[PDB]
């Protein structure tokens, strides 16, 4: 105990509570900027997916490896993770979901390969011992596509070279400003579309120079966009998860102030009485 030692700890917890309030404010602004950047990315993927759907599932459906379900013997995951802490359980929730789905796959005896976005995933998977084969880290507030190009390229090359037979992205979906969910989604072979372009019966493109090489480029760019979107959604999920976590930490500090102040009051009362009793009893 000791009245001064307790008051020092009360001050140190108040200082912690103030720091956590500032971190909550900063995260609550970064979340808005990130979730607007998230909306700036939709048109590219939407209009490209309508084109791919016209070339691939419409009239004169061209054949491509990415379109069709060749038999599976090993699987590839692109995993997005943060470079930062204090985000709550977000990355461990995602990595435990991955390790469960990857273990179900390895029950069937298939092998699995990982490519990492962000330093947290690298650290965790190397501690677990996962087979990471490519990585990019230090994206910060500023995720570029021209840095995603690398690991996406490795996983696309491994697919067309015939090694990987299925490709996934593993990411948190931002749904509400206080609700995010870890998800695994299939990138390749291309997901089935719900819509039918039979109403595009009435027209066809003038394909310059030739449709097959153009469909190859379209599919490569689309996989890239879908990965970039998964990175930006995970980044906005990171800002919202940090906001909520710093809110909770500020309330925990505020409760701990009450409990420390009660202990301080008792200590200072006991000190007053033990002194005044020594003085009065000393005077014969």
């Amino acid at each position: 105990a000791g009245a001064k030692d307790i008051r020092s700890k009360i001050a140190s917890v108040q200082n912690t509570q103030k720091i956590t309030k500032a971190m909550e404010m900063v995260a609550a602004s970064k979340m808005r900027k990130s979730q607007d950047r998230m909306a700036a990315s939709r048109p590219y993927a939407e209009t490209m997916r309508k084109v791919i759907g016209h070339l691939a599932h419409g009239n004169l459906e061209y054949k491509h490896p990415y379109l069709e379900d060749r038999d599976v013997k090993r699987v590839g995951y692109l995993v997005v993770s943060t470079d930062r802490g204090l985000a709550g359980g977000l990355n461990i929730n995602l990595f435990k979901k991955l390790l469960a789905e990857m273990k179900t796959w390895t029950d069937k005896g298939v092998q699995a390969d990982l490519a990492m976005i962000g330093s947290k995933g690298v650290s965790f998977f190397n501690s677990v011992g996962g087979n990471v084969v490519a990585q990019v880290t230090g994206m910060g507030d500023n995720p570029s596509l021209s840095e995603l190009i690398g690991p996406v390229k490795v996983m696309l090359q491994a697919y067309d070279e015939g090694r990987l037979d299925k490709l996934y992205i593993v990411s948190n979906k931002f749904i509400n400003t206080m609700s995010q969910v870890p998800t695994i989604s299939q990138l390749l072979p291309l997901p089935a579309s719900d819509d039918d372009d039979l109403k595009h019966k009435s027209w066809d493109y003038l394909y310059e120079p030739d449709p097959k090489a153009l469909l190859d480029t379209l599919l490569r760019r689309y996989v890239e966009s879908q990965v970039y979107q998964g990175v930006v959604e995970n980044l906005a999920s990171e800002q919202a998860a940090r906001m909520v976590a710093m809110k909770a930490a500020t309330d925990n500090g505020g409760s701990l102030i009450k409990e420390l102040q009660l202990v301080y009051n008792k200590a200072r009362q006991a000190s007053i009485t033990q002194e005044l009793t020594e003085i009065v009893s000393g005077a014969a």
Partner: protein, 118 residues
């Protein structure tokens, strides 16, 4: 004792004590002057008696009644200190006034969440 003379006449009386904590503190000073041993936190040994001898006369009677409104001061913001702890034993109601409610231009600036009555 003036409020008591109003009571005997059959009326309902209000008695305002502008700071009862200072009544406690002057009892402490007089106790020290008389040379009596100091109690739990230096307060006089007769604290809870000196307080009850005052607060027990403020009662309703089958001739009249005295109600009392007492401004209270809590040393070091400690609701456990013997003076607040002895005073709260007697209070029936508790009205808290807050500057936030006044900055909102709301008068009276009574805080309805902390204001309390048994």
């Amino acid at each position: 004792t003036m409020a008591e003379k109003f009571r005997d006449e059959g009326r309902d009386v209000l008695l305002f004590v502008d700071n009862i904590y200072r009544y406690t503190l002057a009892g402490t000073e007089v106790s020290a002057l008389l040379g009596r041993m100091p109690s739990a936190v230096g307060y006089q040994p007769t604290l809870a008696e000196e307080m009850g001898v005052l607060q027990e006369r403020i009662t309703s009677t089958k001739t009249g009644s005295i109600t009392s409104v007492q401004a209270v001061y809590v040393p070091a913001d400690d609701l456990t200190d013997p003076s607040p702890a002895t005073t709260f034993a007697h209070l029936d109601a508790t009205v808290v006034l807050s500057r936030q409610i006044a900055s909102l231009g709301i008068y009276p600036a009574v805080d309805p969440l902390d204001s309390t009555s048994r």
